[PDB]
Each structure stands twice: as structure tokens, then as C-alpha cells.
Amino acid sequence: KNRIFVSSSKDFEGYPSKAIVPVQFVALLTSIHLTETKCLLGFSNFEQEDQYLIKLKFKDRGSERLARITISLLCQYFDIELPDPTVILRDIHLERLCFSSCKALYVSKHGNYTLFLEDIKPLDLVSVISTISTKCDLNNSLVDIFNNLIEMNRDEKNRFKFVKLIHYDIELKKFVQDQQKVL
Amino acid sequence: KNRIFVSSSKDFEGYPSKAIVPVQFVALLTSIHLTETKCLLGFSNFEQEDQYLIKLKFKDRGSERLARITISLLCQYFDIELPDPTVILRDIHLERLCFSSCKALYVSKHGNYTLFLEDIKPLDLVSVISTISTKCDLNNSLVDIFNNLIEMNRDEKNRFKFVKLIHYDIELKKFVQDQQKVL
């Protein structure tokens, strides 16, 4: 195929006013908005605010079920607690880091666009850390994302703090430290 | 609601010739059959053969995508390797134990029936072991399933062998041992 990798939501400024373009990006899951009519997943690389809003479209009950099961599995994979009906989650990153490799379809018309979900592959934090330590687009994104996350942690006013992560590992405490030295 | 818990596929003999009944069961994931038109997930409690065949229906591409993402997430959660197109997996248990709590809709007509997927909650093997060690329907099923799995391991002709599990843990080796004593 010819899937185009996007490193920032701003890339979408050079895209056609009316086209269907397969894209792919890497970011942290930051929010979920599940209703009975639609589902929007928000991701961000913190270049610090929501940036990518992916939509899971569904009209009938059969597809709604699939959307529900999808959200359920994604949340369970990241150890996110779900009450399963309008469901809303925000600033997920403040409590849990959820790196994700996502593939989407950019669909525009009249200059307006929507990113529809094609595939989402969660990335294990342990593998993310390892992948950065030992050692392309994916890796550049993972590095950039972690750097921003590092600057946000230094900033005293910013609500993001590693120590406040429900999964603050000893290994995470170790990677952050040895990661600031590079700075 | 009034979801009925089933402990065996044979229970479906007392069900209506034409009705929609919400059910729920616990079993191991044993097979996947993903095509471009349908998707069937096979589960078994090894009371030793496939027993529950759950279907994920989808007609259009939008719902097919959701089905794909669902299978992708379920497989990733269990560390199952997926090539992502007709996709087939069999005797998954011989390589990986994948306990699952599933909720389905029994839909019959003319005496024939189909179990459609409503929700699937994977169960961590570590939690399964713990839940059995420390210490209802769910627990009875988890115990029964593990007992059958234990007898299948004793049987020399049976292909199922704990030691051959890609995830044979030291803790798994320990739970099995201390579990045969109860027998």
C-alpha cells in the first residue's frame, strides 16, 4: 500500500480538501468518549494537549457491540477501569501511560476531515523503555513523546508527574533518571 | 437484566426453538476463523474438544474493521501472534492458555441456534491461579476447566502438555503440582 506516516497533527494541513488517505501515527491514549451513537479516541504526542481525535463509526447495534468490545479490550490491555451508556475518560496519561501505534484513514471533504480507526496496536511500556534504551519513524516518535513527557514532569505547574502514575515502576523511575542525563 | 449462566454447551438443549436469550460462560479460547465475511471464535471447557463457537457478525467494511481490531486486541492481550485475509488458528491451548469470561446472545430459530458475541473479558492466568488457590459460577467453571486440563496432561496420548506452553511459568509449574495433591 502507501500508508503515510504522520509525526504531528499539523501535517494534515498539506492534505487534500477531499481525499481518502491511509495514515499512521504514534501517541499516548488520553481520552475516550463512548456514546450509543459514536466513539472518539483522543491521542497526543504532547508536542501539551489533545491532538489526534480518532473516530470509531457505527450505526446499527451489531457494530455498536463491536465498538464496545474494542474499547473494553483496549482499556483492559492498559489496566484501565471501565464501567460496563455514555462513557467518558480524560487525561488518562496523568494516571497511566498508554503508548499506541495507530493506523487510520484520513477522510476529508470541503476542507474538513475525520480520522477513522483502522487498527490500534498498544505498546508495552516495558518495550517502549527498552526500545529507547538499547537504541525508525516509530522510534523517533517514541523518543519525542518521552522527551516532552520529561519536560512536562520538570515543569512544576504541569499536572503530569511520573510518581503519580498508578504504575510507577522501579524500572520507570530508573529509565527517567538515566534519560534526563542525555539532556 | 436476566443473563443466564451456562456451564456447558449441552445446556442449550433446554433453550427455546426460537428465542433471544442473553447467556454467559467461561472457557479457554481454542480457535479463530477470520474471513472477510465472518468471524468465529471457538472456546472449550474441555469437559476434550471445541464446544462453544461464538460469532462476530459484520456486513459492511466499517463493521469488518471493528471485528479486525477486536481480534487484534484479543490476540495481543494473550500474546498470540497475528499476521495482519482469511486467518485461522487452532488448538491455541496447546501453546497458550487463554481463559475468558464471555457474554453472548443465544439466537435460535427452527431449533437452530447461534451464539453472537456481546462481550469478552480475558482473564489473566496469574489471577486464575490465585483465584483458585486462595479459594461462584465463574470459580466453579475455572476449577472444572483446570481439573480437565490436569487430566489431559496426565493422559500420555493427549497432545496437551503444560511444559509445552510457551508461557510455562515457574509459578505455573508450582500451581499444577500443588493442585494434583487435591486429587
Binding site: F12, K18, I20, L40, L53, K55, K57, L105, V107, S108, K109, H110, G111, N112, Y113, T114, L115, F116 | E36, T37, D60, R61, G62, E64
Partner: peptide
């Protein structure tokens, strides 16, 4: 030939559905 007629149809409707969805309720408007 039958598995192809279906594909073409499904793909063709998919394109329309997605474009129609963006036209009625875009997630990002300008």
C-alpha cells in the same frame, strides 16, 4: 468472480459512507 463482486460493492459503499459522514459531522472543521 462472486467474491469479487461483493468486495467491489462493500468497498464502494464504504467510500460513500465515510465521505457522507465527514460531510454531515466532521471531527475537524475549518
Amino acid at each position: 468472480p462472486l467474491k469479487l463482486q461483493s468486495r467491489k460493492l462493500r468497498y464502494a459503499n464504504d467510500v460513500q459512507d465515510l465521505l457522507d459522514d465527514v460531510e454531515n459531522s466532521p471531527v475537524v472543521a475549518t
